[PDB]
Every structure is written in structure tokens, then in C-alpha cells.
């Protein structure tokens, strides 16, 4: 009842955020058990940032070059290593607030909560999707580097994103917690364009079903379509393909509303071809693609 | 595009959420120091909910009738009283997770973060605004009663909202933490309609400032207006009149952009009278009214 972008409660992640400093370079780190994870960019001086050789830079550091602060408490670094684009600092104290967790790599279209932090202090939380072009449309200022994205299932935090940089278009790029970038980006201060982005079809459909559950129904029609014919139109409008697995995941929303998946596809097809002609859906003038089927079911049921 | 609804980190509030049960009637409570605050509706049986005599129902209760639980841990109630529409249950344990806090009563237009909870268990966090008709366009399912809204300013949590009920239109009504309703609503299970809503002028102005900051300024014109003349026009388009306080909270955005508040008012006045004429602001044909001047500075700066 009502429909908004809803994040996971952030408390389990807040207790893990720390500040990491190397020289004067500073950013956010994630403290789990006796390891702090942060972007390896922190080992760069100003001059290093443009074109770093990270293996070279790291070999020139020792443990005592790293200042880790949890609030006003300094954590002594007793080991360091690098895993792809993520620096791992072993410290001499276990974080008592460490939740149950895993590191996962998400797929385009999947959503997650971001805890934006500055100087190791959490500032805000919101929901994001990994775009098909592997950027995120985040809300991040200077100093947000190392902020994390996550999902919570029961008591377990699945970390899926660590923030590195803003691109010239104002979208954002980062890695998983194993230090591999999402997308064709590199951890260097040079201008980087992303590939052309597409709309997340299965998510638009999920959001149309949310609209129906909340009584907003003007866009339904009685056409139907084959999956293939819908996919031909979607592709033409820079929408991702809809797979049979996607059709399957929409099953519960289809059953709840009595609207067959391919009928909702026919509705979306007409929205693409005819536009919304000044009308809104769930208060939006645009087709929203950053709610997954799971997101809709959790917020509606 | 650019701005999104961002919530405060919810951890400081998560540690205060409990469950309160009286018979089978169950909802969420807020545990601060040695007091649990919750909606007094919890003392209603099914047959009471339509037209409760709360003084009568409470006289029949003792401390022993209240089950307060932090997860599955019972907190023993040692005192009880009622202040307006909130029940205050004194318990024998001071919450060690109590943050620095205060209770505040907000005005229409002001935004806050909501921590939606079910059975004392946080489920999600999102931002929303108090509408001029004293409702909120929340996202709440059955069992959300007693969920709270808040702002965090320098490690102090300002609690501003406790959720009570959904109205027939799907919008939401509740009290401050002293148990006084926002708007003309009462805590009984009868259809109550909200008064006709209006657009939050001070927030639309904040959003025009946001647009200017980001270089989108086609709508600035060569005119000005008095506040009174503006207010008279605004009401003709179902926009809220501005208060002196509203003028004052636009001060920082005015200073940052060099655009006088009354000049921006004259700009909005022309938009109201003449329409958008095909143009967009921050990528949208709709003027956003749920971002406060404070929200804009937070996200821009
Ligand atoms: C005395 C100290 C206070 C100050 C010293 N100092 C200056 C610093 C500058 C830094 N650079 C960045 C910080 C930052 O928060 N974001 C995120 C962001 N998001 C939205 N915006 C608008 N910015 C970045 O994009 N960059 C650039 C950047 C990061 C990379 F990881 C990468 F690989 C390449 C890159 F170009 C960092 Cl990481 C540490 C610093 N320390
Ligand atoms: C699980 C059961 C076995 C246990 C029994 N039980 C049945 C209950 C029913 C209850 N009533 C409500 C719960 C609830 O979450 N929301 C919020 C909401 N938001 C969006 N939706 C869709 N619902 C409500 O609006 N009401 C109605 C309501 C609340 C008031 F405080 C008020 F003053 C008047 C009112 F009509 C409560 Cl409070 C406790 C109960 N316990």
C-alpha cells in the first residue's frame, strides 16, 4: 500500500564503516572481522592517481603507512595485500559488530541498497540498480569512495558493490568485493565513457504490476503478444530482452493481479509505441526500471 | 536524474524498535532509555477498534497485560500511562542502544526517513514528506503501526512521526511522539478522508534552485513579485502559500545562486500561469515537491 524506492535497514553495515588514510589520501573502508577492505586507489598520491602502477605503488608501502580509524579509535594494521582493485588491511582487532555476510557479484538489473559514507561516517541510504552498461545512477559526492552496496536476507548481508568513481556523465562505477570492476572501467583518474545503456525490461514489467496492485491501471489493454514479437519491439526501443526465466519470475505478480505476463508485455509495447501522453504511473512520468520482481513482492506482500 | 529520495542511515533507530502486544493486538514500539512508546490502539480488542473508549480500556489494564519484546526477549513493564494517542510503558531496562534524541513536531513540506517495521523487526527505510493535508504518501503494509519517522542531525535523532493508520485513499496518518495527530484524524477504525491536498510551494522553489545550481535556468525571467501577491496567485493553482519561515529556509539556496527568493517566486508564477510549453526541468515535465531546501543542499553540496 503505497510504492516507493525502499532500501534495506543500514545498521548492520553502519557498524562496519571505517576511514582509511595513506599519506594524505583518504576514503572509506569496510571492517569485517579482522580485515578492512577499501579501494586500492587510497595508495595513490595526487600524481599517482592519473596513471597508477598499483603493484609498484603497493610494494613501496608497509603496514605503518596505513592509518585506519573506527571513529576516533585507530586500528593497527598488521598486514596488507591487494586483490584486484580492493586493498585488504589485516588489523589486530576483530570488529564485534561484524554481521553474518557474503561477498556476491550481482547481474545487471539487480538492485541493492547503498550506504553513502564520508570520512568513515555514514551519511545516507538509498536503492540503486546495476545498469545493463554496468554503471550505477548513484548519489555520491567527493569523499564517497569505498561506500558499499548490499542486500540483506534474514540476518545475512550480501555485499555486492564498492564505490570507486564518478564518470563525466555523472553516473558511477565500482567493483565487487573481490575487486573486479562492473563494466569496462579502470581505477585511474582519466575520463571514461560507458557503453550505451538500455532499460531493464523485466523490472519495468514488475513496476507495472506494482502499479496495478496499487490501483493504477489506465495503461492496461486487451491486446496480447508472443514473447518473440514483444522482444522484437523491446530491442527496437533499447530495452533488454525478456527471457522465459523472466516470465517465470513474474508468475506470482501475474497470479496476484490476474494479468498474464504476455498481456502486461502487450501493455508495455503500447506504452513504448504511443508514449504516456502526459499521464503518470505511480506518480512517475517515466517508466521505472529499478524495481525488481522480488522488490515488488517484498514491498506489496 | 541527478536527485533522488535519500534516507538517513537507520541504525540508530533500528536498535530502539520493539514489539508491543496486548492480548493478540500487536504492533511496533520505540524503546528509549527505560520507556517504550507505542500507539495506544494496541489496547483495543477487535470489538474495541471501531469506537474505543481509551480511558475505559486503559483502566482495566495493569502492567502485567503488556508484552514488550526486543526480538524474543521480554522487557518487563513496571509502569504505564497514556499521553494523547501514545502509550508510554516504563520497563525495568534502559536501552543501551538509545541514541541522543529529541521529539519534534514537523510542518507540512518537511521530509523525514521512515523505518518500516513488522513485529518489531525493521524491514525497510525510505524518505517521504508530510503533505499539506497532514497525510503522508508512505509505503506501509498491515502490521506497520508504530513504525517511526525521523531526521538525524549530528548524531541526534529527531523523532517526528509515529505511524497509526492507512486512510481509504491509501495515504497514511499518524502522530508525533507526544501522541498528537498530524491533521484532523482520530485513532479509531472508521473511514476518515483527508482534506484536498495542495502542492508544497517551498519545495518546488527548492527544486527550481537545484535546477539552477545544475545549470538548467531557462525559466528565470526579468520580473519579481511581493510575497503577498505571489501567495494570492499560488492559491489559485492549488499551491500552498509561503510562510516567513519558508522564505528563511530558502536563504542558503538564494545566496548560493544569487537568485532572490521573490525573483524565483516570479519565475514559478510564470510557470503556473503559462505552463511548461514543452520544456523540462532537471529532465522532467513535472515540478517535484518532496525535496526540501535542506534536501537540496545535502545532495548538491
Ligand atoms: C586531504 C584529504 C581530505 C583529501 C585527499 N584526497 C583526495 C582524494 C581524491 C580521491 N578521488 C576520488 C574520491 C571520491 O570520493 N570519488 C567518488 C565520487 N563520487 C562522486 N564524486 C563526485 N566523487 C572519486 O571518484 N574519486 C576519483 C577516483 C577514485 C578512484 F577510486 C579511482 F580509481 C579513480 C578516480 F578518478 C580519493 Cl579516492 C581519495 C582522496 N583523498
Ligand atoms: C497479526 C494479527 C494476528 C494480530 C492482531 N491485530 C490486528 C491488528 C490490527 C491493527 N490495525 C492496524 C494495523 C496497521 O498496521 N495499520 C497500518 C497500515 N498501514 C498500511 N496498512 C495496510 N495498514 C493500520 O492502519 N491499522 C488500523 C488502525 C490502526 C490504528 F492505530 C488506528 F488508530 C486505527 C486503525 F484503523 C493493529 Cl494497530 C494491531 C493489530 N493486531
mmCIF file with all atom_site columns, N, CA and C in Angstrom, chain B residues 53-82:
data_model
loop_
_atom_site.group_PDB
_atom_site.id
_atom_site.type_symbol
_atom_site.label_atom_id
_atom_site.label_alt_id
_atom_site.label_comp_id
_atom_site.label_asym_id
_atom_site.label_entity_id
_atom_site.label_seq_id
_atom_site.pdbx_PDB_ins_code
_atom_site.Cartn_x
_atom_site.Cartn_y
_atom_site.Cartn_z
_atom_site.occupancy
_atom_site.B_iso_or_equiv
_atom_site.pdbx_formal_charge
_atom_site.auth_seq_id
_atom_site.auth_comp_id
_atom_site.auth_asym_id
_atom_site.auth_atom_id
_atom_site.pdbx_PDB_model_num
ATOM 1  N N  . UNK B 1 53 ? -13.252 3.544   23.848 1.00 0.00 ? 53 UNK B N  1
ATOM 2  C CA . UNK B 1 53 ? -13.123 4.448   24.971 1.00 0.00 ? 53 UNK B CA 1
ATOM 3  C C  . UNK B 1 53 ? -11.771 4.162   25.628 1.00 0.00 ? 53 UNK B C  1
ATOM 4  N N  . UNK B 1 54 ? -10.771 5.001   25.342 1.00 0.00 ? 54 UNK B N  1
ATOM 5  C CA . UNK B 1 54 ? -9.402  4.627   25.663 1.00 0.00 ? 54 UNK B CA 1
ATOM 6  C C  . UNK B 1 54 ? -9.174  4.726   27.172 1.00 0.00 ? 54 UNK B C  1
ATOM 7  N N  . UNK B 1 55 ? -9.755  5.754   27.815 1.00 0.00 ? 55 UNK B N  1
ATOM 8  C CA . UNK B 1 55 ? -9.667  5.881   29.260 1.00 0.00 ? 55 UNK B CA 1
ATOM 9  C C  . UNK B 1 55 ? -10.244 4.639   29.941 1.00 0.00 ? 55 UNK B C  1
ATOM 10 N N  . UNK B 1 56 ? -11.336 4.111   29.391 1.00 0.00 ? 56 UNK B N  1
ATOM 11 C CA . UNK B 1 56 ? -12.035 2.962   29.953 1.00 0.00 ? 56 UNK B CA 1
ATOM 12 C C  . UNK B 1 56 ? -11.211 1.699   29.770 1.00 0.00 ? 56 UNK B C  1
ATOM 13 N N  . UNK B 1 57 ? -10.648 1.537   28.566 1.00 0.00 ? 57 UNK B N  1
ATOM 14 C CA . UNK B 1 57 ? -9.880  0.350   28.239 1.00 0.00 ? 57 UNK B CA 1
ATOM 15 C C  . UNK B 1 57 ? -8.599  0.294   29.073 1.00 0.00 ? 57 UNK B C  1
ATOM 16 N N  . UNK B 1 58 ? -8.003  1.453   29.343 1.00 0.00 ? 58 UNK B N  1
ATOM 17 C CA . UNK B 1 58 ? -6.706  1.508   29.993 1.00 0.00 ? 58 UNK B CA 1
ATOM 18 C C  . UNK B 1 58 ? -6.843  1.249   31.502 1.00 0.00 ? 58 UNK B C  1
ATOM 19 N N  . UNK B 1 59 ? -7.987  1.647   32.073 1.00 0.00 ? 59 UNK B N  1
ATOM 20 C CA . UNK B 1 59 ? -8.276  1.448   33.489 1.00 0.00 ? 59 UNK B CA 1
ATOM 21 C C  . UNK B 1 59 ? -8.360  -0.035  33.827 1.00 0.00 ? 59 UNK B C  1
ATOM 22 N N  . UNK B 1 60 ? -8.788  -0.834  32.854 1.00 0.00 ? 60 UNK B N  1
ATOM 23 C CA . UNK B 1 60 ? -8.896  -2.275  33.004 1.00 0.00 ? 60 UNK B CA 1
ATOM 24 C C  . UNK B 1 60 ? -7.541  -2.978  32.820 1.00 0.00 ? 60 UNK B C  1
ATOM 25 N N  . UNK B 1 61 ? -6.492  -2.246  32.424 1.00 0.00 ? 61 UNK B N  1
ATOM 26 C CA . UNK B 1 61 ? -5.176  -2.841  32.201 1.00 0.00 ? 61 UNK B CA 1
ATOM 27 C C  . UNK B 1 61 ? -4.277  -2.596  33.402 1.00 0.00 ? 61 UNK B C  1
ATOM 28 N N  . UNK B 1 62 ? -3.385  -3.552  33.656 1.00 0.00 ? 62 UNK B N  1
ATOM 29 C CA . UNK B 1 62 ? -2.257  -3.356  34.555 1.00 0.00 ? 62 UNK B CA 1
ATOM 30 C C  . UNK B 1 62 ? -0.959  -3.601  33.776 1.00 0.00 ? 62 UNK B C  1
ATOM 31 N N  . UNK B 1 63 ? 0.183   -3.358  34.409 1.00 0.00 ? 63 UNK B N  1
ATOM 32 C CA . UNK B 1 63 ? 1.481   -3.584  33.791 1.00 0.00 ? 63 UNK B CA 1
ATOM 33 C C  . UNK B 1 63 ? 1.604   -4.988  33.191 1.00 0.00 ? 63 UNK B C  1
ATOM 34 N N  . UNK B 1 64 ? 1.019   -5.981  33.882 1.00 0.00 ? 64 UNK B N  1
ATOM 35 C CA . UNK B 1 64 ? 1.109   -7.392  33.539 1.00 0.00 ? 64 UNK B CA 1
ATOM 36 C C  . UNK B 1 64 ? 0.417   -7.762  32.231 1.00 0.00 ? 64 UNK B C  1
ATOM 37 N N  . UNK B 1 65 ? -0.433  -6.886  31.689 1.00 0.00 ? 65 UNK B N  1
ATOM 38 C CA . UNK B 1 65 ? -1.171  -7.166  30.464 1.00 0.00 ? 65 UNK B CA 1
ATOM 39 C C  . UNK B 1 65 ? -0.343  -6.809  29.221 1.00 0.00 ? 65 UNK B C  1
ATOM 40 N N  . UNK B 1 66 ? 0.828   -6.172  29.415 1.00 0.00 ? 66 UNK B N  1
ATOM 41 C CA . UNK B 1 66 ? 1.607   -5.694  28.279 1.00 0.00 ? 66 UNK B CA 1
ATOM 42 C C  . UNK B 1 66 ? 2.799   -6.610  28.031 1.00 0.00 ? 66 UNK B C  1
ATOM 43 N N  . UNK B 1 67 ? 2.901   -7.159  26.809 1.00 0.00 ? 67 UNK B N  1
ATOM 44 C CA . UNK B 1 67 ? 4.076   -7.940  26.430 1.00 0.00 ? 67 UNK B CA 1
ATOM 45 C C  . UNK B 1 67 ? 4.959   -7.097  25.513 1.00 0.00 ? 67 UNK B C  1
ATOM 46 N N  . UNK B 1 68 ? 6.136   -6.721  26.016 1.00 0.00 ? 68 UNK B N  1
ATOM 47 C CA . UNK B 1 68 ? 7.103   -5.946  25.257 1.00 0.00 ? 68 UNK B CA 1
ATOM 48 C C  . UNK B 1 68 ? 8.266   -6.892  24.976 1.00 0.00 ? 68 UNK B C  1
ATOM 49 N N  . UNK B 1 69 ? 8.696   -6.935  23.712 1.00 0.00 ? 69 UNK B N  1
ATOM 50 C CA . UNK B 1 69 ? 9.732   -7.852  23.264 1.00 0.00 ? 69 UNK B CA 1
ATOM 51 C C  . UNK B 1 69 ? 10.720  -7.154  22.331 1.00 0.00 ? 69 UNK B C  1
ATOM 52 N N  . UNK B 1 70 ? 12.000  -7.251  22.686 1.00 0.00 ? 70 UNK B N  1
ATOM 53 C CA . UNK B 1 70 ? 13.113  -6.894  21.817 1.00 0.00 ? 70 UNK B CA 1
ATOM 54 C C  . UNK B 1 70 ? 13.608  -8.188  21.175 1.00 0.00 ? 70 UNK B C  1
ATOM 55 N N  . UNK B 1 71 ? 13.215  -8.421  19.921 1.00 0.00 ? 71 UNK B N  1
ATOM 56 C CA . UNK B 1 71 ? 13.327  -9.756  19.350 1.00 0.00 ? 71 UNK B CA 1
ATOM 57 C C  . UNK B 1 71 ? 12.438  -10.729 20.126 1.00 0.00 ? 71 UNK B C  1
ATOM 58 N N  . UNK B 1 72 ? 13.014  -11.786 20.716 1.00 0.00 ? 72 UNK B N  1
ATOM 59 C CA . UNK B 1 72 ? 12.239  -12.701 21.557 1.00 0.00 ? 72 UNK B CA 1
ATOM 60 C C  . UNK B 1 72 ? 12.480  -12.476 23.056 1.00 0.00 ? 72 UNK B C  1
ATOM 61 N N  . UNK B 1 73 ? 13.214  -11.414 23.392 1.00 0.00 ? 73 UNK B N  1
ATOM 62 C CA . UNK B 1 73 ? 13.498  -11.113 24.780 1.00 0.00 ? 73 UNK B CA 1
ATOM 63 C C  . UNK B 1 73 ? 12.402  -10.202 25.332 1.00 0.00 ? 73 UNK B C  1
ATOM 64 N N  . UNK B 1 74 ? 11.724  -10.673 26.363 1.00 0.00 ? 74 UNK B N  1
ATOM 65 C CA . UNK B 1 74 ? 10.710  -9.876  27.031 1.00 0.00 ? 74 UNK B CA 1
ATOM 66 C C  . UNK B 1 74 ? 11.351  -8.778  27.891 1.00 0.00 ? 74 UNK B C  1
ATOM 67 N N  . UNK B 1 75 ? 10.828  -7.556  27.808 1.00 0.00 ? 75 UNK B N  1
ATOM 68 C CA . UNK B 1 75 ? 11.164  -6.465  28.713 1.00 0.00 ? 75 UNK B CA 1
ATOM 69 C C  . UNK B 1 75 ? 10.005  -6.269  29.685 1.00 0.00 ? 75 UNK B C  1
ATOM 70 N N  . UNK B 1 76 ? 10.291  -6.373  30.973 1.00 0.00 ? 76 UNK B N  1
ATOM 71 C CA . UNK B 1 76 ? 9.250   -6.324  31.982 1.00 0.00 ? 76 UNK B CA 1
ATOM 72 C C  . UNK B 1 76 ? 8.744   -4.892  32.151 1.00 0.00 ? 76 UNK B C  1
ATOM 73 N N  . UNK B 1 77 ? 7.423   -4.720  32.058 1.00 0.00 ? 77 UNK B N  1
ATOM 74 C CA . UNK B 1 77 ? 6.787   -3.428  32.197 1.00 0.00 ? 77 UNK B CA 1
ATOM 75 C C  . UNK B 1 77 ? 6.551   -3.148  33.681 1.00 0.00 ? 77 UNK B C  1
ATOM 76 N N  . UNK B 1 78 ? 6.986   -1.975  34.168 1.00 0.00 ? 78 UNK B N  1
ATOM 77 C CA . UNK B 1 78 ? 6.838   -1.635  35.582 1.00 0.00 ? 78 UNK B CA 1
ATOM 78 C C  . UNK B 1 78 ? 5.978   -0.379  35.774 1.00 0.00 ? 78 UNK B C  1
ATOM 79 N N  . UNK B 1 79 ? 5.503   0.229   34.676 1.00 0.00 ? 79 UNK B N  1
ATOM 80 C CA . UNK B 1 79 ? 4.617   1.386   34.754 1.00 0.00 ? 79 UNK B CA 1
ATOM 81 C C  . UNK B 1 79 ? 3.949   1.617   33.395 1.00 0.00 ? 79 UNK B C  1
ATOM 82 N N  . UNK B 1 80 ? 2.793   2.286   33.381 1.00 0.00 ? 80 UNK B N  1
ATOM 83 C CA . UNK B 1 80 ? 2.127   2.581   32.126 1.00 0.00 ? 80 UNK B CA 1
ATOM 84 C C  . UNK B 1 80 ? 1.325   3.862   32.278 1.00 0.00 ? 80 UNK B C  1
ATOM 85 N N  . UNK B 1 81 ? 1.304   4.661   31.219 1.00 0.00 ? 81 UNK B N  1
ATOM 86 C CA . UNK B 1 81 ? 0.412   5.806   31.149 1.00 0.00 ? 81 UNK B CA 1
ATOM 87 C C  . UNK B 1 81 ? 0.134   6.114   29.682 1.00 0.00 ? 81 UNK B C  1
ATOM 88 N N  . UNK B 1 82 ? -0.762  7.082   29.468 1.00 0.00 ? 82 UNK B N  1
ATOM 89 C CA . UNK B 1 82 ? -1.204  7.418   28.134 1.00 0.00 ? 82 UNK B CA 1
ATOM 90 C C  . UNK B 1 82 ? -1.068  8.927   28.006 1.00 0.00 ? 82 UNK B C  1
#
